[PDB]
Amino acid sequence: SSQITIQARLISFESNRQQLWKLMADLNTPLINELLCQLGQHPDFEKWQQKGKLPSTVVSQLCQPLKTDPRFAGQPSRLYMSAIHIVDYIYKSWLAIQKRLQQQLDGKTRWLEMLNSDAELVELSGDTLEAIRVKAAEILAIAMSLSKTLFDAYQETEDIKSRSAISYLLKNGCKLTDKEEDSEKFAKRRRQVEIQIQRLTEKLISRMPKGRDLTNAKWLETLLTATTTVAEDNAQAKRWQDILLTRSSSLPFPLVFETNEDMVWSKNQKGRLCVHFNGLSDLIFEVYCGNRQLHWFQRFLEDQQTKRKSKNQHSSGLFTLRNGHLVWLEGEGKGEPWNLHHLTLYCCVDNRLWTEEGTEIVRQEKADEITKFITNMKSDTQQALIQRKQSTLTRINNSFERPSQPLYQGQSHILVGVSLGLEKPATVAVVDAIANKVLAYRSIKQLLGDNYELLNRQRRQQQYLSHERHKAQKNFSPNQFGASELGQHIDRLLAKAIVALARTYKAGSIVLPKLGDMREVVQSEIQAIAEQKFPGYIEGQQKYAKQYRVNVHRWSYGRLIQSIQSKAAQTGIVIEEGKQPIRGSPHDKAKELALSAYNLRL
DNA sequence: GTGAAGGTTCTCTTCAGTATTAATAAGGCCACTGTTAAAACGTACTATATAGACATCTCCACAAAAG
């Protein structure tokens, strides 16, 4: 996770900002909207959902006739390209989501079929429980990936004895068990799977990507319709209401510049770094950044100047800058939108390209990938692709003469396990795995140190700000706020503390748990309990454990994992994934998480 | 004639998914019975511990006959 974003304000005189706003809002965003509409109507759309993959070129092909439609014709080539990238990534995202959800629904539907109680397994096997227990002992002795191997063994073995023995073996977590099945805990575990299947089935009714209408013409024409026309029935009037409540999108889609050299850097005579974008060189924007990021923007000019001095004998494949996003940030107050909103550039950089040693890491990664490509790839334009790839492979050998910082060296036998929990967001154990000894624990309080008071602040603000929103909603007041930025701050403080401890003990890796989807587990567990406690009373079921379900939906385990992954990559510490045990305290969970990831190395 | 804008391709994704070890629970009012200590409280079949109205025997003092 070595890619990170740095940002700066872009400043320019009003006519440059107005011209860019009108390009984005009047042409580029309407084009994106049109591409999303046409792409969702394509005759292959239903087979793209089955593959879960979009064709590499279909957005580019749809955009070609639109580039000369009077609605969209006025744009530079890179703005059409940006619109293509926006639309292509949206569907690459959405088709990947739907594909995995469909696989989850199919997987659990098979499990629901093969989850049979011992009373059902007796009939469906025709064998006594001891007989299927012995047959499961044989099938386990052959399947010795074990879970998948049993799922593979189940499907084509139509022999109901072995098929039931696999069912019995899978019910217990791929192992034998002597103890009797508690019939109500089984019936609950069956009911959980039905709820999960239903909730997956409902999630697969997701909407197609909606776009951003900045005119909101549909709202005003619906208002005129609903006020002067009789609704033909309740369903038309409901559709009218649903439109009238829909909020207006203020801001256009950002521009995306996937060619780092489509940002051209310079220093003006007042000494400020400046940038202009390919196709819009007349609009000079001035960089206004914090000094904590200035060294990156200075590097972008130095990388640009280095390759010009070498007459392009360097490769921009090793430019520290990777891509840019050009974004309008919503301004407070009033004005024309190019005056109200603040133009902001977000630059992706790869942190390894800062140093010379890290650049050598990237160079070999580039060289191996391109040598693979050239070997596997072998038309005129496809031969031109090979020649560009071969030019890259030649030019990445030329050095940028970057700062030298020796790479981190961590001991392979020292690991940090990080236990994640709802009550204690992180707990760490430094384990010496060949010694099987814990070198150090730290609690959440020791990780946060002097910041530990922020953790009670978060809980207190989450309560307070929720209640103030609840009160504000009843007044239709816009003053609705929350603690997300404090929560993000805490997760970043924890990430830095964990990695600093890992560096201090020379740990080779940080071990993080494969939590899965905690929210759908908790939500289906609690619903199965509540349906027994409040039969036929839906509101009673939804009130049951409401605050626990809320707490689990706020638990930011993904954001914390992501923050740890970024900080570890910036110091070259390996991340490993392990299985967090359910037994024990957060300290013991962290220790056994660490040691299991060591033993799982094969 | 260095700089600006614009062109071009990048493959296949029949793969990934489906199993545990699971925590005390996460429901709150209303009324309505029915237990469950455990506190408050009428009164019984007893086990003694006296207090004192009476009955009893004993020791000592007086009239009739004989030398």
From TrEMBL:
InterPro entries: V_Cas12k. It comes from the Bacteria. This is ShCas12k. It comes from Scytonema hofmannii. The lineage of its organism: Bacteria, Bacillati, Cyanobacteriota, Cyanophyceae, Nostocales.
